[PDB]
Amino acid sequence: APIRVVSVPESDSFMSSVPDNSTPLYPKVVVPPRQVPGRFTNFIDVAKQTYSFCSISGKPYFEVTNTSGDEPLFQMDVSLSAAELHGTYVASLSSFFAQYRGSLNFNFIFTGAAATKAKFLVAFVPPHSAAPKTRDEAMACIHAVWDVGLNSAFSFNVPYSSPADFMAVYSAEATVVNVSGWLQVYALTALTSTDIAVNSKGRVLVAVSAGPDFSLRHPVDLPDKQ
């Protein structure tokens, strides 16, 4: 008559992720409909269909003067906790996890006078050297050149290239898996204005859209606040 069973040693323990609920103490509670639009099932979803300003210096944009040329314009170690990619949606989302596998996109919204032209260059430096510091060094890598004047912004896709199928959503001392490299933009042509008088500098917004192949795997509690 009575069934025969054996408790596992574990048995009367907790389990903070038991695939299966608990005892339904209140029942039959019918719930009212919801008519609110702008709903979501997936979080990656929102960061793909939405950019966020990267924080260069304390602002979300770099400058372009008619006295630049050689010098780098913008640089940062492509890892989801590198300075610039700190305040972004896409990067702040990440920290509920441990891993990402995606190429990112950036959009350069030039905001200088409508009498200003700046022309220009972006470059992705895979990890190896110790940060090229002149386009003449950087142009020998993957780069794109762009001419503001009629465009009114631009887009560059920093891909995913590495031996590991997933990388780290957390930066740390130089590993083959932390760093994916740098992202760089250069003054391929020092800015110009109707008068150097009226128009001193031009600027450019650096917006970060999640790439089209990007995804976060593995949820993880939050460490300490540092």
């Binding site: 008559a1 009575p2 069934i3 025969r4």
Partner: peptide, 21 residues
């Protein structure tokens, strides 16, 4: 008789009870 639970036959009727002929 007083055994109206659907677990009574966990032990088949040979082990459970006896048998006549």
């Amino acid at each position: 008789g007083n055994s109206g639970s659907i677990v009574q036959n966990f032990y088949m009727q040979q082990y459970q009870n006896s048998i006549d002929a």
